[PDB]
Amino acid sequence: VLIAIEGVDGAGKRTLVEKLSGAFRAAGRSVATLAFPRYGQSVAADIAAEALHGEHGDLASSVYAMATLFALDRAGAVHTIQGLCRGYDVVILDRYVASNAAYSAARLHENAAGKAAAWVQRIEFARLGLPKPDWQVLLAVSDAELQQRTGAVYAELAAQGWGGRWLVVGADVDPGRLAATLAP
Ligand SMILES: COc1cccc(-c2cc(-c3ccc(C(=O)O)cc3)c(C#N)c(=O)[nH]2)c1
């Protein structure tokens, strides 16, 4: 089983990744995890991070520019992901394709049924061949307007079943229970 943990920064996705890892392994499962963007390895991921800190002239001013950058990062790891799914019972991804839909829709003031979110699917899953996750787990916990709104879009994706089955959880979800829901 392949699982994206999704949510906003500061939301504490990494902690939930570690939590589920323990639980899955407690349940007798081999787990691999991997996190995006892959700063330090993907030149794309790096140029995106940099473009957001002022560098690279007018790059960050284009929503589809950034999304294309974060997409190309993930696409670069497509063979590793595919390869972890052949070697482990579970592969947990901290941020994945639905990150691009939430952050783009939010910046473009669009909703889950809109163009950005549709575009992310064509590019990342269809065109670039990234595998659809079996589950996407939104960690939804209490630029701030944009961060609120991106939070809200994520949740629109959960509600629409965008990309596949989802689950929405908060800060104190029991890991054993969530693990047993997410597993066969
Ligand atoms: C800035 O404008 C745009 C425009 C379009 C897409 C995106 C966008 C953002 C991220 C992202 C990465 C790290 C963190 C963090 O840890 O704060 C937060 C968000 C991902 C990912 N992964 C992605 O795919 N797309 C951003």
Query: Measured in angstroms, how far is the CA atom of residue 29 from the centroid of ligand 1?
Result: 30
| Residue written as token pair 């629109």 | 156
Which residues, judged by CB distance below 6 Å to any ligand atom, belong to the binding site of ligand 1?
A: 9, 36-37, 52, 63, 66-67, 70, 95, 99-100, 103-104, 107
In Å, what resolution does this model reach? 2.5
Name which residue sits closest to atom 14 of ligand 1, judged by CA. 9
**Parallel, antiparallel, or unpaired for β 2-6 and 31-35?**
unpaired
Domains by residue range for the chain, with CATH: 1-184 (3.40.50.300)
Technique used by the depositors: X-ray
